[PDB]
Amino acid sequence: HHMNESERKIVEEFQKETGINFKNEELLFRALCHSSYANEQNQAGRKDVESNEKLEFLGDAVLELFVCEILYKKYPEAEVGDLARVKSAAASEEVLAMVSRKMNLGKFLFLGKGEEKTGGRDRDSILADAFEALLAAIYLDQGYEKIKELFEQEFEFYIEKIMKGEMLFDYKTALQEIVQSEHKVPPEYILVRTEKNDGDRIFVVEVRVNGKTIATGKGRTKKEAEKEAARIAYEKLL
Amino acid sequence: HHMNESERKIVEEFQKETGINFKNEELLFRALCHSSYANEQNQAGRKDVESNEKLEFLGDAVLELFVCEILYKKYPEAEVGDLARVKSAAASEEVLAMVSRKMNLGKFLFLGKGEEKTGGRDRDSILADAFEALLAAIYLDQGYEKIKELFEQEFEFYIEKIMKGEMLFDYKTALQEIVQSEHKVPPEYILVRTEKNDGDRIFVVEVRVNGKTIATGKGRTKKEAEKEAARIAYEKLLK
C-alpha cells in the first residue's frame, strides 16, 4: 500500500506526538485503519488499504501475555482466582479506551466518512480495538521488549489499583470536575520531593485546593504521582 | 523448595529424555506438580512444594500468543473469523493433551496418591494443564524463541489441518487399529523419497499394508510425512 499525502502526514504526526517511532510505517497505518475506512478506500479502488482487524486479533494475545506476565511476576502470593479477576479487568475495553484517550489515539484513526459523522472517533470499542492493533504492530515491528519498555510501568500501575480493589478511572479529570464544582477553582499539583525507595526513583506530589493540601500521592514518575494524588484526594473528598 | 531424591530423578530424566535442559530446575518441577501432589506434600510439612496452577495461568497466555502469531503470519488472507476458530481449536484441551502424550509428559507429572489411583496420570485436563505450565516454565527460563524452536513446526502442522478443516487426532494409532483389525498385520511406513522444494527438505512417505501402498504423505520431517500418510489412508479407508 502506497500512503497518500494525508495518510503519511497522520502517520508522521502519530510518531512525533506519541514518541513511538516505527521502522515499518505500514504496520502503524494498518493499526490505525478502522474497517470503515478500509472499505471506503477499497470501494474507491485502493485495494491495498487494509483494516486493523487482523492486528487486533494478534494484539489481544500480545496484551493477554503482557498483563499475565506482570501478574505472574509481581503477585507471587496472589490466589489464581485473583490473577484471573485482575487480568480480565486490566485488559477490558474500559481500561484500554482510557489508555487510548490518554494517548490522543482518536486523533490518528482512519475512519470512513459515515463513521466519522456518527461519532466513531469517540467510540470506546473502536479506540480499544485500535489500541490492541497498535500493540500487535509494535510487537511485529520492534518486539515484545519494546512493548514492555513503552507500557509496563503504566500497566503495572493499573494492575496494582485493580489488585487492591481500588476503582480505576481518569483520576485527574474526575478530581478537577469535583473541585471546580465545589470551589470554583481547579486543583493544584505540587511535586514536593522525590525518594529512592525499593530501587525506583519516587515522586511525591500533593494535590491542593486554595493552597490547602488535600492529599499526597507517590509514584515512579511525576505523572503517576499526580494520578495517585488525585485518586486519594477524590476518594477523600467523597 | 529442596527437591528430594525422587523429585530430583524425575527432573533429571525429563531433561535427558526431552532434551529441554533448564537453567532453573525449580521452574520445571513446579510445572510438573499437580495440586494433589503439592497439597499432599504441604500436609506432610514440605510447605515450599507448589502446584503448577500459576505457571499454567501464565502458560495459557504464552500459548495464545504463540498460536495467534503463527495464524497471523501464515494465513494473511484468512478471514478473522477463521483465525478465531482455528485459535480455539489449536489451543484446545484435546490438542494439548495429544501434544503432551507425544512428549510422554504423563510419566513426569507429580501426583497425589489418591489422584494417581483415580487415573490422573492419563487425564486429558491434567495433561493439558501441565503442558501449558511447561510452556510458561520454558518461557521464563529460556524465552519465547526457545518455545518456537521447540514447538513451532509441530503447531504449524496442527494449525494447517484445522485451518483446512481436516480432523486432527493421532492418525497413526487410529490407522493401526483399523488395519490390524481388517488384515491381521500392521501398516508400514516407508520413506520413499526426500527432496528440497523451495523452502527446505520434504519427505515423501508411503503407508502400506502387505507391501501395497494405501496412501502417500508429505511433510517437512519424516514423522510429519508419516502422520500425513496415515491421515490420508484413514480417511480413504472409510470408502
Side-chain angles (χ1 to χ4, degrees), chain B residues 117-151:
Chain B
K117 197 181 176 188
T118 63
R121 204 168 290 277
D122 306 308
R123 185 162 294 115
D124 280 15
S125 65
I126 294 171
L127 290 165
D129 284 348
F131 177 80
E132 294 192 26
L134 176 62
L135 293 174
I138 295 171
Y139 173 73
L140 290 171
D141 191 69
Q142 301 194 245
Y144 190 70
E145 289 300 316
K146 179 56 169 177
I147 291 283
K148 300 206 275 186
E149 174 191 315
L150 294 168
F151 305 113

PDB file of all heavy atoms in Angstrom, chain B residues 117-151:
ATOM      1  N   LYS B 117      -4.256 -42.830  41.880  1.00  0.00           N
ATOM      2  CA  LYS B 117      -5.077 -44.043  41.902  1.00  0.00           C
ATOM      3  C   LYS B 117      -6.353 -43.908  41.082  1.00  0.00           C
ATOM      4  O   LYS B 117      -6.892 -44.897  40.582  1.00  0.00           O
ATOM      5  CB  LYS B 117      -5.430 -44.430  43.340  1.00  0.00           C
ATOM      6  CG  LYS B 117      -5.910 -45.856  43.464  1.00  0.00           C
ATOM      7  CD  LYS B 117      -6.270 -46.208  44.891  1.00  0.00           C
ATOM      8  CE  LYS B 117      -6.841 -47.634  44.974  1.00  0.00           C
ATOM      9  NZ  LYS B 117      -7.373 -47.888  46.337  1.00  0.00           N
ATOM     10  N   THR B 118      -6.843 -42.681  40.933  1.00  0.00           N
ATOM     11  CA  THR B 118      -8.065 -42.496  40.172  1.00  0.00           C
ATOM     12  C   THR B 118      -7.811 -42.201  38.700  1.00  0.00           C
ATOM     13  O   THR B 118      -8.661 -41.633  38.036  1.00  0.00           O
ATOM     14  CB  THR B 118      -8.930 -41.381  40.767  1.00  0.00           C
ATOM     15  OG1 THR B 118      -8.232 -40.133  40.705  1.00  0.00           O
ATOM     16  CG2 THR B 118      -9.266 -41.710  42.219  1.00  0.00           C
ATOM     17  N   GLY B 119      -6.628 -42.570  38.208  1.00  0.00           N
ATOM     18  CA  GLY B 119      -6.318 -42.363  36.803  1.00  0.00           C
ATOM     19  C   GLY B 119      -5.873 -40.970  36.378  1.00  0.00           C
ATOM     20  O   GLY B 119      -5.916 -40.636  35.197  1.00  0.00           O
ATOM     21  N   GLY B 120      -5.415 -40.165  37.327  1.00  0.00           N
ATOM     22  CA  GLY B 120      -4.985 -38.819  36.999  1.00  0.00           C
ATOM     23  C   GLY B 120      -3.858 -38.661  35.994  1.00  0.00           C
ATOM     24  O   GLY B 120      -3.823 -37.673  35.260  1.00  0.00           O
ATOM     25  N   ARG B 121      -2.937 -39.619  35.942  1.00  0.00           N
ATOM     26  CA  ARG B 121      -1.812 -39.521  35.024  1.00  0.00           C
ATOM     27  C   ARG B 121      -2.232 -39.601  33.557  1.00  0.00           C
ATOM     28  O   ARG B 121      -1.478 -39.202  32.670  1.00  0.00           O
ATOM     29  CB  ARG B 121      -0.785 -40.621  35.339  1.00  0.00           C
ATOM     30  CG  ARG B 121       0.638 -40.307  34.895  1.00  0.00           C
ATOM     31  CD  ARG B 121       1.602 -41.304  35.498  1.00  0.00           C
ATOM     32  NE  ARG B 121       1.739 -41.105  36.937  1.00  0.00           N
ATOM     33  CZ  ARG B 121       2.553 -40.208  37.481  1.00  0.00           C
ATOM     34  NH1 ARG B 121       3.307 -39.433  36.701  1.00  0.00           N
ATOM     35  NH2 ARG B 121       2.614 -40.086  38.797  1.00  0.00           N
ATOM     36  N   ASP B 122      -3.443 -40.101  33.308  1.00  0.00           N
ATOM     37  CA  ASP B 122      -3.946 -40.234  31.938  1.00  0.00           C
ATOM     38  C   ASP B 122      -5.065 -39.237  31.659  1.00  0.00           C
ATOM     39  O   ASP B 122      -5.650 -39.253  30.581  1.00  0.00           O
ATOM     40  CB  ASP B 122      -4.470 -41.667  31.700  1.00  0.00           C
ATOM     41  CG  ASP B 122      -3.435 -42.717  32.049  1.00  0.00           C
ATOM     42  OD1 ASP B 122      -2.291 -42.600  31.547  1.00  0.00           O
ATOM     43  OD2 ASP B 122      -3.753 -43.639  32.839  1.00  0.00           O
ATOM     44  N   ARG B 123      -5.359 -38.368  32.632  1.00  0.00           N
ATOM     45  CA  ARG B 123      -6.445 -37.403  32.474  1.00  0.00           C
ATOM     46  C   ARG B 123      -6.098 -36.251  31.536  1.00  0.00           C
ATOM     47  O   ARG B 123      -5.155 -35.480  31.790  1.00  0.00           O
ATOM     48  CB  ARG B 123      -6.858 -36.852  33.854  1.00  0.00           C
ATOM     49  CG  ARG B 123      -8.076 -35.920  33.789  1.00  0.00           C
ATOM     50  CD  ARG B 123      -8.755 -35.716  35.135  1.00  0.00           C
ATOM     51  NE  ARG B 123      -9.357 -36.959  35.612  1.00  0.00           N
ATOM     52  CZ  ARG B 123      -8.956 -37.602  36.702  1.00  0.00           C
ATOM     53  NH1 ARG B 123      -7.962 -37.103  37.422  1.00  0.00           N
ATOM     54  NH2 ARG B 123      -9.521 -38.756  37.052  1.00  0.00           N
ATOM     55  N   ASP B 124      -6.867 -36.128  30.458  1.00  0.00           N
ATOM     56  CA  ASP B 124      -6.649 -35.074  29.469  1.00  0.00           C
ATOM     57  C   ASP B 124      -6.450 -33.700  30.097  1.00  0.00           C
ATOM     58  O   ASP B 124      -5.534 -32.976  29.716  1.00  0.00           O
ATOM     59  CB  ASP B 124      -7.820 -34.985  28.478  1.00  0.00           C
ATOM     60  CG  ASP B 124      -7.744 -36.030  27.382  1.00  0.00           C
ATOM     61  OD1 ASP B 124      -6.972 -37.003  27.515  1.00  0.00           O
ATOM     62  OD2 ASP B 124      -8.457 -35.883  26.372  1.00  0.00           O
ATOM     63  N   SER B 125      -7.299 -33.334  31.054  1.00  0.00           N
ATOM     64  CA  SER B 125      -7.190 -31.991  31.653  1.00  0.00           C
ATOM     65  C   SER B 125      -5.873 -31.796  32.414  1.00  0.00           C
ATOM     66  O   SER B 125      -5.244 -30.754  32.323  1.00  0.00           O
ATOM     67  CB  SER B 125      -8.391 -31.711  32.576  1.00  0.00           C
ATOM     68  OG  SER B 125      -8.416 -32.576  33.708  1.00  0.00           O
ATOM     69  N   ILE B 126      -5.478 -32.786  33.196  1.00  0.00           N
ATOM     70  CA  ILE B 126      -4.220 -32.697  33.948  1.00  0.00           C
ATOM     71  C   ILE B 126      -3.051 -32.606  32.962  1.00  0.00           C
ATOM     72  O   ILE B 126      -2.139 -31.799  33.114  1.00  0.00           O
ATOM     73  CB  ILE B 126      -4.053 -33.924  34.906  1.00  0.00           C
ATOM     74  CG1 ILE B 126      -5.132 -33.871  35.995  1.00  0.00           C
ATOM     75  CG2 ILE B 126      -2.641 -33.930  35.537  1.00  0.00           C
ATOM     76  CD1 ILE B 126      -5.232 -35.118  36.871  1.00  0.00           C
ATOM     77  N   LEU B 127      -3.090 -33.413  31.910  1.00  0.00           N
ATOM     78  CA  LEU B 127      -2.013 -33.373  30.926  1.00  0.00           C
ATOM     79  C   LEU B 127      -1.936 -32.010  30.199  1.00  0.00           C
ATOM     80  O   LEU B 127      -0.855 -31.449  29.991  1.00  0.00           O
ATOM     81  CB  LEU B 127      -2.235 -34.492  29.883  1.00  0.00           C
ATOM     82  CG  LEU B 127      -2.019 -35.917  30.427  1.00  0.00           C
ATOM     83  CD1 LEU B 127      -2.598 -36.942  29.473  1.00  0.00           C
ATOM     84  CD2 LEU B 127      -0.506 -36.156  30.635  1.00  0.00           C
ATOM     85  N   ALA B 128      -3.084 -31.493  29.789  1.00  0.00           N
ATOM     86  CA  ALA B 128      -3.111 -30.236  29.041  1.00  0.00           C
ATOM     87  C   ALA B 128      -2.621 -29.116  29.930  1.00  0.00           C
ATOM     88  O   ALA B 128      -1.861 -28.268  29.478  1.00  0.00           O
ATOM     89  CB  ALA B 128      -4.531 -29.940  28.531  1.00  0.00           C
ATOM     90  N   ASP B 129      -3.077 -29.111  31.187  1.00  0.00           N
ATOM     91  CA  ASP B 129      -2.661 -28.094  32.154  1.00  0.00           C
ATOM     92  C   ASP B 129      -1.142 -28.094  32.384  1.00  0.00           C
ATOM     93  O   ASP B 129      -0.504 -27.046  32.415  1.00  0.00           O
ATOM     94  CB  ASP B 129      -3.335 -28.318  33.521  1.00  0.00           C
ATOM     95  CG  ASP B 129      -4.817 -27.891  33.548  1.00  0.00           C
ATOM     96  OD1 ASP B 129      -5.302 -27.219  32.615  1.00  0.00           O
ATOM     97  OD2 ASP B 129      -5.492 -28.240  34.535  1.00  0.00           O
ATOM     98  N   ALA B 130      -0.563 -29.272  32.584  1.00  0.00           N
ATOM     99  CA  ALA B 130       0.870 -29.320  32.827  1.00  0.00           C
ATOM    100  C   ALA B 130       1.657 -28.840  31.602  1.00  0.00           C
ATOM    101  O   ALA B 130       2.709 -28.211  31.746  1.00  0.00           O
ATOM    102  CB  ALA B 130       1.292 -30.752  33.224  1.00  0.00           C
ATOM    103  N   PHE B 131       1.134 -29.106  30.407  1.00  0.00           N
ATOM    104  CA  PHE B 131       1.825 -28.701  29.185  1.00  0.00           C
ATOM    105  C   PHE B 131       1.806 -27.184  29.099  1.00  0.00           C
ATOM    106  O   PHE B 131       2.784 -26.591  28.717  1.00  0.00           O
ATOM    107  CB  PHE B 131       1.149 -29.264  27.935  1.00  0.00           C
ATOM    108  CG  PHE B 131       1.802 -28.813  26.661  1.00  0.00           C
ATOM    109  CD1 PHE B 131       2.974 -29.436  26.206  1.00  0.00           C
ATOM    110  CD2 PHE B 131       1.290 -27.736  25.940  1.00  0.00           C
ATOM    111  CE1 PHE B 131       3.613 -28.987  25.048  1.00  0.00           C
ATOM    112  CE2 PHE B 131       1.917 -27.281  24.786  1.00  0.00           C
ATOM    113  CZ  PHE B 131       3.086 -27.908  24.332  1.00  0.00           C
ATOM    114  N   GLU B 132       0.663 -26.563  29.403  1.00  0.00           N
ATOM    115  CA  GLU B 132       0.603 -25.113  29.384  1.00  0.00           C
ATOM    116  C   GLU B 132       1.571 -24.593  30.474  1.00  0.00           C
ATOM    117  O   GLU B 132       2.270 -23.598  30.280  1.00  0.00           O
ATOM    118  CB  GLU B 132      -0.830 -24.630  29.690  1.00  0.00           C
ATOM    119  CG  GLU B 132      -1.838 -24.999  28.626  1.00  0.00           C
ATOM    120  CD  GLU B 132      -3.141 -24.254  28.832  1.00  0.00           C
ATOM    121  OE1 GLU B 132      -3.094 -23.162  29.426  1.00  0.00           O
ATOM    122  OE2 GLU B 132      -4.205 -24.744  28.400  1.00  0.00           O
ATOM    123  N   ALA B 133       1.598 -25.260  31.621  1.00  0.00           N
ATOM    124  CA  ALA B 133       2.509 -24.852  32.699  1.00  0.00           C
ATOM    125  C   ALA B 133       3.959 -24.991  32.205  1.00  0.00           C
ATOM    126  O   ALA B 133       4.814 -24.122  32.446  1.00  0.00           O
ATOM    127  CB  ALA B 133       2.275 -25.720  33.935  1.00  0.00           C
ATOM    128  N   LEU B 134       4.240 -26.064  31.472  1.00  0.00           N
ATOM    129  CA  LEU B 134       5.594 -26.275  30.964  1.00  0.00           C
ATOM    130  C   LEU B 134       5.957 -25.131  30.003  1.00  0.00           C
ATOM    131  O   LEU B 134       7.087 -24.621  30.040  1.00  0.00           O
ATOM    132  CB  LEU B 134       5.688 -27.611  30.224  1.00  0.00           C
ATOM    133  CG  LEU B 134       7.042 -27.896  29.578  1.00  0.00           C
ATOM    134  CD1 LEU B 134       8.191 -27.969  30.606  1.00  0.00           C
ATOM    135  CD2 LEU B 134       6.905 -29.199  28.824  1.00  0.00           C
ATOM    136  N   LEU B 135       5.014 -24.735  29.142  1.00  0.00           N
ATOM    137  CA  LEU B 135       5.320 -23.636  28.225  1.00  0.00           C
ATOM    138  C   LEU B 135       5.733 -22.402  29.021  1.00  0.00           C
ATOM    139  O   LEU B 135       6.689 -21.719  28.638  1.00  0.00           O
ATOM    140  CB  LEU B 135       4.144 -23.290  27.326  1.00  0.00           C
ATOM    141  CG  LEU B 135       3.722 -24.339  26.303  1.00  0.00           C
ATOM    142  CD1 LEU B 135       2.430 -23.861  25.603  1.00  0.00           C
ATOM    143  CD2 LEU B 135       4.862 -24.560  25.289  1.00  0.00           C
ATOM    144  N   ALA B 136       5.011 -22.106  30.110  1.00  0.00           N
ATOM    145  CA  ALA B 136       5.358 -20.950  30.965  1.00  0.00           C
ATOM    146  C   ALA B 136       6.766 -21.103  31.547  1.00  0.00           C
ATOM    147  O   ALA B 136       7.556 -20.167  31.541  1.00  0.00           O
ATOM    148  CB  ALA B 136       4.359 -20.796  32.104  1.00  0.00           C
ATOM    149  N   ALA B 137       7.076 -22.286  32.052  1.00  0.00           N
ATOM    150  CA  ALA B 137       8.395 -22.559  32.626  1.00  0.00           C
ATOM    151  C   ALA B 137       9.510 -22.321  31.616  1.00  0.00           C
ATOM    152  O   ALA B 137      10.533 -21.673  31.926  1.00  0.00           O
ATOM    153  CB  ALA B 137       8.473 -24.039  33.167  1.00  0.00           C
ATOM    154  N   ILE B 138       9.323 -22.834  30.404  1.00  0.00           N
ATOM    155  CA  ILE B 138      10.343 -22.669  29.367  1.00  0.00           C
ATOM    156  C   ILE B 138      10.464 -21.181  28.960  1.00  0.00           C
ATOM    157  O   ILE B 138      11.561 -20.654  28.733  1.00  0.00           O
ATOM    158  CB  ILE B 138      10.005 -23.537  28.115  1.00  0.00           C
ATOM    159  CG1 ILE B 138      10.063 -25.043  28.479  1.00  0.00           C
ATOM    160  CG2 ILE B 138      10.972 -23.227  26.986  1.00  0.00           C
ATOM    161  CD1 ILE B 138       9.531 -25.917  27.370  1.00  0.00           C
ATOM    162  N   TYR B 139       9.316 -20.520  28.896  1.00  0.00           N
ATOM    163  CA  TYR B 139       9.248 -19.112  28.530  1.00  0.00           C
ATOM    164  C   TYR B 139      10.045 -18.292  29.543  1.00  0.00           C
ATOM    165  O   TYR B 139      10.826 -17.422  29.168  1.00  0.00           O
ATOM    166  CB  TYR B 139       7.777 -18.650  28.529  1.00  0.00           C
ATOM    167  CG  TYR B 139       7.608 -17.163  28.338  1.00  0.00           C
ATOM    168  CD1 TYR B 139       7.835 -16.584  27.103  1.00  0.00           C
ATOM    169  CD2 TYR B 139       7.235 -16.337  29.403  1.00  0.00           C
ATOM    170  CE1 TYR B 139       7.694 -15.209  26.909  1.00  0.00           C
ATOM    171  CE2 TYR B 139       7.096 -14.952  29.227  1.00  0.00           C
ATOM    172  CZ  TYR B 139       7.328 -14.401  27.975  1.00  0.00           C
ATOM    173  OH  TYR B 139       7.185 -13.044  27.763  1.00  0.00           O
ATOM    174  N   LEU B 140       9.832 -18.571  30.825  1.00  0.00           N
ATOM    175  CA  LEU B 140      10.544 -17.863  31.887  1.00  0.00           C
ATOM    176  C   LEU B 140      12.020 -18.242  31.973  1.00  0.00           C
ATOM    177  O   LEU B 140      12.865 -17.379  32.156  1.00  0.00           O
ATOM    178  CB  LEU B 140       9.877 -18.131  33.230  1.00  0.00           C
ATOM    179  CG  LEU B 140       8.500 -17.470  33.368  1.00  0.00           C
ATOM    180  CD1 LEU B 140       7.827 -17.998  34.653  1.00  0.00           C
ATOM    181  CD2 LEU B 140       8.651 -15.944  33.384  1.00  0.00           C
ATOM    182  N   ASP B 141      12.334 -19.525  31.809  1.00  0.00           N
ATOM    183  CA  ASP B 141      13.727 -19.997  31.896  1.00  0.00           C
ATOM    184  C   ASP B 141      14.588 -19.717  30.671  1.00  0.00           C
ATOM    185  O   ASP B 141      15.750 -19.355  30.811  1.00  0.00           O
ATOM    186  CB  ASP B 141      13.772 -21.520  32.148  1.00  0.00           C
ATOM    187  CG  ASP B 141      15.200 -22.035  32.511  1.00  0.00           C
ATOM    188  OD1 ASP B 141      15.702 -21.717  33.592  1.00  0.00           O
ATOM    189  OD2 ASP B 141      15.822 -22.773  31.725  1.00  0.00           O
ATOM    190  N   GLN B 142      14.026 -19.894  29.479  1.00  0.00           N
ATOM    191  CA  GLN B 142      14.813 -19.738  28.256  1.00  0.00           C
ATOM    192  C   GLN B 142      14.282 -18.767  27.228  1.00  0.00           C
ATOM    193  O   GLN B 142      14.989 -18.424  26.302  1.00  0.00           O
ATOM    194  CB  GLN B 142      14.991 -21.088  27.577  1.00  0.00           C
ATOM    195  CG  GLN B 142      15.687 -22.125  28.419  1.00  0.00           C
ATOM    196  CD  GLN B 142      16.132 -23.328  27.601  1.00  0.00           C
ATOM    197  OE1 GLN B 142      15.648 -24.443  27.802  1.00  0.00           O
ATOM    198  NE2 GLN B 142      17.059 -23.103  26.661  1.00  0.00           N
ATOM    199  N   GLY B 143      13.026 -18.354  27.360  1.00  0.00           N
ATOM    200  CA  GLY B 143      12.487 -17.395  26.418  1.00  0.00           C
ATOM    201  C   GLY B 143      11.574 -17.913  25.332  1.00  0.00           C
ATOM    202  O   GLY B 143      11.505 -19.107  25.037  1.00  0.00           O
ATOM    203  N   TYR B 144      10.887 -16.956  24.717  1.00  0.00           N
ATOM    204  CA  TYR B 144       9.937 -17.194  23.655  1.00  0.00           C
ATOM    205  C   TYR B 144      10.541 -17.863  22.412  1.00  0.00           C
ATOM    206  O   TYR B 144       9.899 -18.724  21.815  1.00  0.00           O
ATOM    207  CB  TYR B 144       9.269 -15.858  23.273  1.00  0.00           C
ATOM    208  CG  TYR B 144       8.089 -16.005  22.332  1.00  0.00           C
ATOM    209  CD1 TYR B 144       6.888 -16.568  22.771  1.00  0.00           C
ATOM    210  CD2 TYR B 144       8.174 -15.553  21.027  1.00  0.00           C
ATOM    211  CE1 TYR B 144       5.791 -16.669  21.924  1.00  0.00           C
ATOM    212  CE2 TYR B 144       7.084 -15.646  20.154  1.00  0.00           C
ATOM    213  CZ  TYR B 144       5.896 -16.208  20.620  1.00  0.00           C
ATOM    214  OH  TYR B 144       4.829 -16.290  19.779  1.00  0.00           O
ATOM    215  N   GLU B 145      11.751 -17.469  22.020  1.00  0.00           N
ATOM    216  CA  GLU B 145      12.402 -18.060  20.847  1.00  0.00           C
ATOM    217  C   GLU B 145      12.628 -19.554  21.070  1.00  0.00           C
ATOM    218  O   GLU B 145      12.580 -20.336  20.134  1.00  0.00           O
ATOM    219  CB  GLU B 145      13.754 -17.393  20.558  1.00  0.00           C
ATOM    220  CG  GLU B 145      13.685 -15.949  20.013  1.00  0.00           C
ATOM    221  CD  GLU B 145      12.935 -15.842  18.690  1.00  0.00           C
ATOM    222  OE1 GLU B 145      13.165 -16.704  17.800  1.00  0.00           O
ATOM    223  OE2 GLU B 145      12.128 -14.892  18.537  1.00  0.00           O
ATOM    224  N   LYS B 146      12.864 -19.951  22.310  1.00  0.00           N
ATOM    225  CA  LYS B 146      13.069 -21.366  22.573  1.00  0.00           C
ATOM    226  C   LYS B 146      11.738 -22.104  22.382  1.00  0.00           C
ATOM    227  O   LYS B 146      11.700 -23.234  21.887  1.00  0.00           O
ATOM    228  CB  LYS B 146      13.617 -21.566  23.992  1.00  0.00           C
ATOM    229  CG  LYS B 146      13.857 -23.030  24.394  1.00  0.00           C
ATOM    230  CD  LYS B 146      14.795 -23.769  23.432  1.00  0.00           C
ATOM    231  CE  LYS B 146      15.220 -25.123  23.995  1.00  0.00           C
ATOM    232  NZ  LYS B 146      16.066 -25.870  23.019  1.00  0.00           N
ATOM    233  N   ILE B 147      10.635 -21.457  22.758  1.00  0.00           N
ATOM    234  CA  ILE B 147       9.334 -22.096  22.599  1.00  0.00           C
ATOM    235  C   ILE B 147       9.088 -22.386  21.105  1.00  0.00           C
ATOM    236  O   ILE B 147       8.611 -23.468  20.741  1.00  0.00           O
ATOM    237  CB  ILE B 147       8.196 -21.194  23.102  1.00  0.00           C
ATOM    238  CG1 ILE B 147       8.267 -21.058  24.629  1.00  0.00           C
ATOM    239  CG2 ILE B 147       6.819 -21.764  22.620  1.00  0.00           C
ATOM    240  CD1 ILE B 147       7.754 -22.234  25.357  1.00  0.00           C
ATOM    241  N   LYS B 148       9.394 -21.418  20.250  1.00  0.00           N
ATOM    242  CA  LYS B 148       9.191 -21.596  18.794  1.00  0.00           C
ATOM    243  C   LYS B 148      10.116 -22.707  18.265  1.00  0.00           C
ATOM    244  O   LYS B 148       9.708 -23.578  17.497  1.00  0.00           O
ATOM    245  CB  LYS B 148       9.510 -20.296  18.041  1.00  0.00           C
ATOM    246  CG  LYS B 148       8.655 -19.100  18.466  1.00  0.00           C
ATOM    247  CD  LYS B 148       8.503 -18.054  17.362  1.00  0.00           C
ATOM    248  CE  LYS B 148       9.658 -17.078  17.321  1.00  0.00           C
ATOM    249  NZ  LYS B 148       9.372 -16.000  16.329  1.00  0.00           N
ATOM    250  N   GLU B 149      11.375 -22.633  18.667  1.00  0.00           N
ATOM    251  CA  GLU B 149      12.349 -23.622  18.257  1.00  0.00           C
ATOM    252  C   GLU B 149      11.812 -25.023  18.605  1.00  0.00           C
ATOM    253  O   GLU B 149      11.876 -25.935  17.795  1.00  0.00           O
ATOM    254  CB  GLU B 149      13.655 -23.328  18.995  1.00  0.00           C
ATOM    255  CG  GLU B 149      14.746 -24.324  18.814  1.00  0.00           C
ATOM    256  CD  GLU B 149      15.868 -24.065  19.793  1.00  0.00           C
ATOM    257  OE1 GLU B 149      16.256 -22.865  19.933  1.00  0.00           O
ATOM    258  OE2 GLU B 149      16.349 -25.047  20.416  1.00  0.00           O
ATOM    259  N   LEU B 150      11.228 -25.180  19.788  1.00  0.00           N
ATOM    260  CA  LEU B 150      10.706 -26.491  20.208  1.00  0.00           C
ATOM    261  C   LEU B 150       9.361 -26.928  19.615  1.00  0.00           C
ATOM    262  O   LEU B 150       9.169 -28.097  19.282  1.00  0.00           O
ATOM    263  CB  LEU B 150      10.544 -26.528  21.734  1.00  0.00           C
ATOM    264  CG  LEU B 150      11.799 -26.446  22.576  1.00  0.00           C
ATOM    265  CD1 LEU B 150      11.420 -26.203  24.040  1.00  0.00           C
ATOM    266  CD2 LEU B 150      12.577 -27.791  22.437  1.00  0.00           C
ATOM    267  N   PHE B 151       8.438 -25.980  19.475  1.00  0.00           N
ATOM    268  CA  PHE B 151       7.069 -26.319  19.071  1.00  0.00           C
ATOM    269  C   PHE B 151       6.464 -25.702  17.833  1.00  0.00           C
ATOM    270  O   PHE B 151       5.381 -26.119  17.424  1.00  0.00           O
ATOM    271  CB  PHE B 151       6.118 -25.992  20.238  1.00  0.00           C
ATOM    272  CG  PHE B 151       6.490 -26.647  21.535  1.00  0.00           C
ATOM    273  CD1 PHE B 151       6.922 -25.886  22.611  1.00  0.00           C
ATOM    274  CD2 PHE B 151       6.418 -28.041  21.678  1.00  0.00           C
ATOM    275  CE1 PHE B 151       7.284 -26.490  23.827  1.00  0.00           C
ATOM    276  CE2 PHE B 151       6.773 -28.657  22.879  1.00  0.00           C
ATOM    277  CZ  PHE B 151       7.212 -27.869  23.965  1.00  0.00           C
TER     278      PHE B 151
END
